[PDB]
Amino acid sequence: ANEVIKCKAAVAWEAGKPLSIEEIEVAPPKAHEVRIKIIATAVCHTDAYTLSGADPEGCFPVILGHEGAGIVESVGEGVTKLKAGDTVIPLYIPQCGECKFCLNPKTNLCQKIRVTQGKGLMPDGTSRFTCKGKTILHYMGTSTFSEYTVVADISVAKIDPLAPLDKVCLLGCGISTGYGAAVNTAKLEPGSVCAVFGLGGVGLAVIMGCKVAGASRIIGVDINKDKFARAKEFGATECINPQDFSKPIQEVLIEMTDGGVDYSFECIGNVKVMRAALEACHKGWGVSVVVGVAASGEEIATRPFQLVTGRTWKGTAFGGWKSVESVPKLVSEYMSKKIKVDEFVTHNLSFDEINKAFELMHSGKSIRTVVKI
Amino acid sequence: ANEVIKCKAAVAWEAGKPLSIEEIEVAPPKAHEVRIKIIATAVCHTDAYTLSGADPEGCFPVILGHEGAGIVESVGEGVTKLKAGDTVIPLYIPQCGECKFCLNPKTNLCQKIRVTQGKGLMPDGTSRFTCKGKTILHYMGTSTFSEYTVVADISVAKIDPLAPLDKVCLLGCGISTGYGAAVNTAKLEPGSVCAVFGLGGVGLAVIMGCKVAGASRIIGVDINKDKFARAKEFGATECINPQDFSKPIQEVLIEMTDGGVDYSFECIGNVKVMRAALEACHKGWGVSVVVGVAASGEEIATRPFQLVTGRTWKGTAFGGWKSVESVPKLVSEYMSKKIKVDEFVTHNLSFDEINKAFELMHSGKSIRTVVKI
Ligand SMILES: NC(=O)c1ccc[n+]([C@@H]2O[C@H](COP(=O)([O-])OP(=O)(O)OC[C@H]3O[C@@H](n4cnc5c(N)ncnc54)[C@H](O)[C@@H]3O)[C@@H](O)[C@H]2O)c1
Ligand SMILES: NC(=O)c1ccc[n+]([C@@H]2O[C@H](COP(=O)([O-])OP(=O)(O)OC[C@H]3O[C@@H](n4cnc5c(N)ncnc54)[C@H](O)[C@@H]3O)[C@@H](O)[C@H]2O)c1
Ligand SMILES: N[C@@H](CCC(=O)N[C@@H](CSCO)C(=O)NCC(=O)O)C(=O)O
Ligand SMILES: [K+]
Ligand SMILES: [Zn+2]
Ligand SMILES: [Zn+2]
Ligand SMILES: [Zn+2]
Ligand SMILES: [Zn+2]
């Protein structure tokens, strides 16, 4: 039978404090849940956002992390598709396959367990984590910052058993989102001119997709010149820094493309930049995709004349991928060298140095840091 | 050759005042210009919008009117495809047929003469109108409030001679716009749930459009409940008055539709309503098309979350119709009984009493009033 597991995990006891490697107990999978052994996990600004305490939905104590890869240790009752030993990737965006959203081709926002997930609990409404007698909450339905975690069976993607987990763990968030943003949400046609605001993991993943889509031009935009080199490596035909212009960045791009870009992508989370990204699109057919997440309360704006004159405002969630179906495929494209992953890893750390991941992130000296459990 | 024409026209000397029946002069067609004898014309809200001054490019004195129909009185040098006697409709949105835009299937916004047109002048930078020694400006390139008008030769649609001009003149704007907002911009699929804000001429044309597309639920929304009766006759499954509810109209719609409409259309020009229309859309795939023209400087807004979670903001002009190609086909669809036009005419007046047409519109008593020249 499946027993309780005593393992280590980086607990976030309180907002605004660093993570604490702690000894915890992980309960066995209940019906339609699977316990996974995380081999590798990366850190994203999203983890940091909840850690700061600025997140209205963030609760503590909790186990963060939503970018991991690992192996199925065991499954609860009712679980057929998965078995102990399967190589997998936890999914913050699930795919039950039967809800209103899963059944609609135009979205991937499965709602079967959203409510319970926002509260950091399994579908049965209870947490599977305990530490020093206290209950520790789940996070984004994944909690990848533990040697062992439990997720809803509808939150797992079975992937190629040969995929390096300390690499592929990044398909859990940033790469898939950026890539899908270009290929799924925008569906840019070969030869189109694109602009990308923000050159972090997401922006680079976007550039990657524009390049596979056959974009004729791909303009990178970032206030951090250091990001340019790698962007060019990814496919950016040219990079520009807003700080080097006195005119609004929209006007700059319009000049550079004789009207504006065919597609633009905001990968920062800055409401003002989002407006610029929209306005920088070509009149009559320009499309702008918002990929970045703005701080609660903040809102976007522009003159309706912009939409009336042909521009379209869009957005994306996890690159619009139906998680369970897509991720295994994305892994295969990686194995086939169709897409890049290794190139997104800028730093590697052991589980104890996990806090340094957050530090590298603020330094801006980082795209993605993979933490070996 | 062609001589000057001494005729009658409704001149608007200054904003915020009723038009003035004046005896003007109309110069002959210069190279690539066409002089049209207007047989019938109506009043779109956009005409009043300009007459009030809220137009970013409203200059006076000017001869308004962009919904009309008549006969080609004569043509200027180089005009081959159009001859005297041709039954035509003046287009405020041209189709040069060769610019960057005309060649792109994703738009209908020819820019060939947009600049000059915005200033109320012919392509050569001059006006063909004069009254009491003072030069009078064109409007939207059509100026249909005159017995005779001169337009660019790329602002002319040659239609079926048999078409009743006192009817199809409405296809010059309102009807075609609303209809296309649904068929071209939204391209709504059969069975989709729709919401239409503003049940005027444009709104009913939107409903008519949703109906032909095979929409399931079509929810009309208007503060003037007297608009409901005809809305339902056009296809609205039901109407709701925003005032009869304490909750913001978005929540009402979200509640009625178990999440929001698949498509919404703002046909009023209210920036706050435009935001509601977008937020009334369903998560993951909702699309909102802005059709109404907003007052200078005003902007629409919302939390980017709305876009990130699946909703799309679009806009349209003249329903996205390639004017010179489409209008002729549109009157054909009217002739074949495929779309309605006659049911839009609620009043009829002579030229001398054109101001009454404006009063009725501000009174909300009409949809469209055809003024017999
Ligand atoms: N929609 C989704 O599903 C989804 C998924 C993951 C992440 N995100 C969001 O994507 C955004 C980016 O994530 P990331 O990992 O790539 O983060 P990142 O911080 O590493 O990338 C952002 C880049 O934007 C640059 N930048 C900041 N202000 C700028 C400005 N005014 N103009 C141009 N560039 C500017 C920064 O220097 C940085 O290089 C965040 O909002 C993240 O939360 C969304
Ligand atoms: N994009 C285009 O090409 C295009 C074309 C034609 C018209 N327009 C614009 O579309 C709008 C409608 O034009 P029209 O000729 O049909 O005028 P209209 O007077 O017939 O439309 C106004 C209708 O909306 C209703 N309405 C006003 N405020 C409302 C509110 N707060 N909530 C619900 N309903 C409200 C009015 O009572 C009336 O029923 C105007 O802004 C017009 O300028 C745009
Ligand atoms: N002058 C306004 C724009 C007004 C506007 O949107 N006009 C529509 C037709 S409304 C039908 O009566 C249009 O043709 N848009 C395309 C364009 O104006 O180039 C403003 O500047 O805000
Ligand atoms: K569609
Ligand atoms: Zn992340
Ligand atoms: Zn689902
Ligand atoms: Zn109009
Ligand atoms: Zn053109």
mmCIF file of N, CA and C in Angstrom, chain B residues 1-6 25-36 73-77 122 124 126-130 138 148-151:
data_model
loop_
_atom_site.group_PDB
_atom_site.id
_atom_site.type_symbol
_atom_site.label_atom_id
_atom_site.label_comp_id
_atom_site.label_asym_id
_atom_site.label_seq_id
_atom_site.Cartn_x
_atom_site.Cartn_y
_atom_site.Cartn_z
ATOM 1 N N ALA B 1 -17.807 70.305 -72.825
ATOM 2 C CA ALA B 1 -17.281 69.837 -71.510
ATOM 3 C C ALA B 1 -18.333 70.022 -70.417
ATOM 4 N N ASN B 2 -17.954 69.734 -69.179
ATOM 5 C CA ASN B 2 -18.873 69.865 -68.064
ATOM 6 C C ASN B 2 -18.809 71.257 -67.458
ATOM 7 N N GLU B 3 -19.973 71.870 -67.301
ATOM 8 C CA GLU B 3 -20.053 73.201 -66.740
ATOM 9 C C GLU B 3 -20.345 73.157 -65.248
ATOM 10 N N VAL B 4 -20.268 74.310 -64.602
ATOM 11 C CA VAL B 4 -20.534 74.397 -63.176
ATOM 12 C C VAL B 4 -22.019 74.155 -62.968
ATOM 13 N N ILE B 5 -22.396 73.653 -61.800
ATOM 14 C CA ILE B 5 -23.805 73.419 -61.526
ATOM 15 C C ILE B 5 -24.303 74.316 -60.406
ATOM 16 N N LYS B 6 -25.430 74.961 -60.668
ATOM 17 C CA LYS B 6 -26.064 75.850 -59.711
ATOM 18 C C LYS B 6 -27.199 75.004 -59.134
ATOM 19 N N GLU B 25 -22.929 76.221 -55.688
ATOM 20 C CA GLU B 25 -22.344 75.987 -56.996
ATOM 21 C C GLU B 25 -21.515 74.716 -56.860
ATOM 22 N N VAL B 26 -21.542 73.876 -57.884
ATOM 23 C CA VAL B 26 -20.774 72.647 -57.858
ATOM 24 C C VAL B 26 -19.886 72.627 -59.091
ATOM 25 N N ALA B 27 -18.577 72.604 -58.876
ATOM 26 C CA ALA B 27 -17.643 72.591 -59.988
ATOM 27 C C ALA B 27 -17.716 71.251 -60.707
ATOM 28 N N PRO B 28 -17.246 71.204 -61.959
ATOM 29 C CA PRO B 28 -17.267 69.954 -62.723
ATOM 30 C C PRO B 28 -16.184 68.997 -62.220
ATOM 31 N N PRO B 29 -16.254 67.718 -62.618
ATOM 32 C CA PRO B 29 -15.274 66.707 -62.201
ATOM 33 C C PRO B 29 -13.883 66.896 -62.801
ATOM 34 N N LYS B 30 -12.876 67.031 -61.941
ATOM 35 C CA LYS B 30 -11.505 67.163 -62.420
ATOM 36 C C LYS B 30 -11.038 65.738 -62.725
ATOM 37 N N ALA B 31 -9.811 65.580 -63.208
ATOM 38 C CA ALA B 31 -9.318 64.246 -63.525
ATOM 39 C C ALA B 31 -9.626 63.278 -62.381
ATOM 40 N N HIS B 32 -10.117 62.095 -62.734
ATOM 41 C CA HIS B 32 -10.442 61.060 -61.760
ATOM 42 C C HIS B 32 -11.404 61.454 -60.650
ATOM 43 N N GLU B 33 -12.435 62.196 -61.035
ATOM 44 C CA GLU B 33 -13.489 62.621 -60.128
ATOM 45 C C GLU B 33 -14.821 62.307 -60.814
ATOM 46 N N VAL B 34 -15.871 62.155 -60.022
ATOM 47 C CA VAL B 34 -17.179 61.850 -60.569
ATOM 48 C C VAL B 34 -18.233 62.730 -59.920
ATOM 49 N N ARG B 35 -19.052 63.392 -60.735
ATOM 50 C CA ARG B 35 -20.114 64.232 -60.190
ATOM 51 C C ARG B 35 -21.398 63.415 -60.215
ATOM 52 N N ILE B 36 -21.990 63.249 -59.041
ATOM 53 C CA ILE B 36 -23.205 62.462 -58.890
ATOM 54 C C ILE B 36 -24.440 63.280 -58.537
ATOM 55 N N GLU B 73 -23.775 62.082 -63.016
ATOM 56 C CA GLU B 73 -24.098 63.219 -63.858
ATOM 57 C C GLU B 73 -23.008 63.424 -64.915
ATOM 58 N N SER B 74 -21.756 63.129 -64.566
ATOM 59 C CA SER B 74 -20.626 63.270 -65.492
ATOM 60 C C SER B 74 -19.309 62.852 -64.839
ATOM 61 N N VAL B 75 -18.277 62.637 -65.651
ATOM 62 C CA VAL B 75 -16.978 62.222 -65.121
ATOM 63 C C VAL B 75 -15.806 63.056 -65.633
ATOM 64 N N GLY B 76 -14.736 63.102 -64.842
ATOM 65 C CA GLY B 76 -13.555 63.857 -65.221
ATOM 66 C C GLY B 76 -12.584 63.064 -66.075
ATOM 67 N N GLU B 77 -11.481 63.705 -66.449
ATOM 68 C CA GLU B 77 -10.445 63.076 -67.261
ATOM 69 C C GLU B 77 -10.015 61.725 -66.706
ATOM 70 N N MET B 122 -11.005 67.219 -52.020
ATOM 71 C CA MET B 122 -10.846 66.193 -53.035
ATOM 72 C C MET B 122 -9.366 65.785 -53.027
ATOM 73 N N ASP B 124 -6.984 66.290 -55.022
ATOM 74 C CA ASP B 124 -6.085 67.357 -55.455
ATOM 75 C C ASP B 124 -5.922 68.460 -54.405
ATOM 76 N N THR B 126 -8.359 70.365 -53.130
ATOM 77 C CA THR B 126 -9.345 71.436 -53.219
ATOM 78 C C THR B 126 -10.777 70.927 -53.103
ATOM 79 N N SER B 127 -11.696 71.853 -52.861
ATOM 80 C CA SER B 127 -13.116 71.545 -52.732
ATOM 81 C C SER B 127 -13.885 71.990 -53.976
ATOM 82 N N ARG B 128 -14.939 71.257 -54.321
ATOM 83 C CA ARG B 128 -15.753 71.593 -55.483
ATOM 84 C C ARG B 128 -16.975 72.413 -55.060
ATOM 85 N N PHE B 129 -17.108 72.660 -53.759
ATOM 86 C CA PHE B 129 -18.242 73.415 -53.240
ATOM 87 C C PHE B 129 -17.963 74.876 -52.908
ATOM 88 N N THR B 130 -18.934 75.722 -53.229
ATOM 89 C CA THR B 130 -18.864 77.151 -52.963
ATOM 90 C C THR B 130 -20.275 77.648 -52.696
ATOM 91 N N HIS B 138 -16.074 69.385 -48.165
ATOM 92 C CA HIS B 138 -16.675 68.081 -48.380
ATOM 93 C C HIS B 138 -16.699 67.395 -47.031
ATOM 94 N N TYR B 148 -26.343 67.780 -56.037
ATOM 95 C CA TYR B 148 -25.190 67.301 -56.790
ATOM 96 C C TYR B 148 -23.951 67.304 -55.910
ATOM 97 N N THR B 149 -23.115 66.284 -56.067
ATOM 98 C CA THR B 149 -21.890 66.187 -55.289
ATOM 99 C C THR B 149 -20.782 65.629 -56.165
ATOM 100 N N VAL B 150 -19.531 65.914 -55.803
ATOM 101 C CA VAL B 150 -18.377 65.405 -56.546
ATOM 102 C C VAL B 150 -17.530 64.550 -55.611
ATOM 103 N N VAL B 151 -17.163 63.357 -56.062
ATOM 104 C CA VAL B 151 -16.362 62.457 -55.243
ATOM 105 C C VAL B 151 -15.185 61.912 -56.034
#
